[PDB]
Amino acid sequence: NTTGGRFVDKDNRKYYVKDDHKAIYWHKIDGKTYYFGDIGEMVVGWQYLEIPGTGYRDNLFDNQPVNEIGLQEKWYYFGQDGALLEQTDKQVLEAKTSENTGKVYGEQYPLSAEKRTYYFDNNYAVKTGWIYEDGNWYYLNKLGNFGDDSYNPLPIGEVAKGWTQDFHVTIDIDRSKPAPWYYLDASGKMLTDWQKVNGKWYYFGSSGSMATGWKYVRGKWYYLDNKNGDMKTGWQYLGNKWYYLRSSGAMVTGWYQDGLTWYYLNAGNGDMKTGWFQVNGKWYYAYSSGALAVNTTVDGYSVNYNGEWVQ
Ligand SMILES: CC(C)[N@+]1(C)[C@@H]2CC[C@H]1C[C@@H](OC(=O)[C@@H](CO)c1ccccc1)C2
Ligand SMILES: CC(C)[N@+]1(C)[C@@H]2CC[C@H]1C[C@@H](OC(=O)[C@@H](CO)c1ccccc1)C2
Ligand SMILES: CC(C)[N@+]1(C)[C@@H]2CC[C@H]1C[C@@H](OC(=O)[C@@H](CO)c1ccccc1)C2
Ligand SMILES: C[N+](C)(C)CCO
Ligand SMILES: C[N+](C)(C)CCO
Ligand SMILES: C[N+](C)(C)CCO
Ligand SMILES: C[N+](C)(C)CCO
Ligand SMILES: C[N+](C)(C)CCO
Ligand SMILES: C[N+](C)(C)CCO
């Protein structure tokens, strides 16, 4: 809603001058939106800026005070004429790189030979987070790359690929909130259910979040690394108890013979039994290793070839 001034070309830059002053920051002029930075140089192309609309970085001129405000920064796209692209859905645009962002009108720079589909929110900023398209979920980076004492916002809004953690993010990551892991394939499609990645199995369920710990899937129990999510197999000591997982990863219950040795996995919980235990009337004795005692004596007690306590 800025009127009364005029655009001016000087020193290879463009400004908007009203009553002798240069427009700074965000301005809505004659049906279009522009951004003039801190000193008035109209911007063009890709820009990572403080969000507009609060009034703290809007309708301002360089002769006015720039009160201190804390505003999140987001990616916006401006035409070569400086007009903000007021997209709220999506649009194919030159990819943003280290060579075509933060430029101002008058500067010379190359146009990305590569175009990409960028998604936008209802306030014309590049969208981040989850998006659903043509039957699949895609994740647009909420964060840029951290270096130690360094941050690059370029990845924000780009389609994520591979292992990706979904943090709660605003200006910074919210460490108190949960951050599930997801896996996006080569085209960015979010994987669901069982998937073998880098030689190991992971379970992403229906929501796509990587499962950890014990997980009940289609009538069977599986154990995924409590931290890394990879499916375990074979004998596993969990919670001070032994469990046997088949090569398929499914937990075994009942009698199980490993080589010549029998073991008994608790009917429901699946934990390996030790000591004397009864099964369908019969009594059996398992050593501390869980191995069933057979054709021998156990503290004055005889047990036959099936480990059954002989009367
Ligand atoms: C390259 C930009 C900064 N312009 C110099 C172009 C397009 C906007 C600005 C000034 C001029 O265009 C306008 O004055 C009209 C065009 O509709 C306009 C200005 C600002 C917002 C919306 C429209 C020519
Ligand atoms: C906790 C899960 C989601 N990981 C972070 C663990 C195990 C899988 C995932 C990523 C990583 O596992 C990997 O195999 C590493 C090896 O460099 C990896 C990271 C990103 C892409 C491919 C492999 C560490
Ligand atoms: C004759 C068998 C079936 N017992 C009754 C004997 C030997 C095993 C079984 C129970 C008991 O032997 C035990 O070791 C005791 C020890 O508390 C036991 C009782 C209940 C379950 C498991 C062991 C006495
Ligand atoms: C959804 N896209 C932008 C991510 C990829 C093309 O299928
Ligand atoms: C993939 N998501 C949209 C489904 C779920 C994360 O909240
Ligand atoms: C975990 N699965 C993919 C490996 C096997 C189901 O039987
Ligand atoms: C495998 N268990 C320990 C997880 C569950 C049985 O109810
Ligand atoms: C894991 N153990 C103690 C259970 C069995 C021998 O392999
Ligand atoms: C150990 N067994 C003989 C007892 C039972 C499995 O069939």
Instruction: Break the chain into its structural domains and give their ranges.
Output: 1-128, 129-311
φ, ψ for residue 72, nearest 5 deg: -65, 150
Listed resolution, Å = 1.9
CA of 125 from ligand 1 middle (Å) equals: 21
- The CATH classification number of 129-311 equals 2.10.270.10
| CB neighbourhood size of 218 (10 A) | 8
Residue with CA closest to ligand 8 atom 3: 289
Nearest to 132 by CA among 175, 77, 192: 192
Q: Which ligand is nearest to the CA of 140?
A: 4
Secondary structure of residue 43 in the 3-state scheme:
strand
Distance CA 235, CA 44 (A): 62
> Which fold would CATH assign to domain 1-128?
left handed beta-beta-3-solenoid (2.10.270)
Residues 6+ apart with CB under 8 A from 278: 284
Q: Which ligand is nearest to the CA of 192?
A: 5
Distance CA 153, CA 86 (A): 21
Distance CA 155, CA 161 (A): 11
Nearest to 264 by CA among 299, 295, 293, 237: 293
**Residues 171, 173, 176, 177, CA torsion sign:** positive
Which structural technique was applied?
X-ray
Would you say the CB of residue 226 lies under 6 angstroms from ligand 2? no
Contacts of range 257-264, beta carbons closer than 8 Å, 24 or more positions apart: 261/291, 261/292, 262/291, 262/292, 262/294, 262/307, 263/290, 263/291, 263/292, 264/290, 264/292
Q: Are 72 and 21 in contact (CB under 8 A)?
A: no
CA of 182 from ligand 5 middle (Å) equals: 9
CA of 260 from ligand 9 middle (Å) equals: 11
Q: Do domains 1-128 and 129-311 have the same CATH topology?
A: yes
CA of 81 from ligand 1 middle (Å) equals: 6
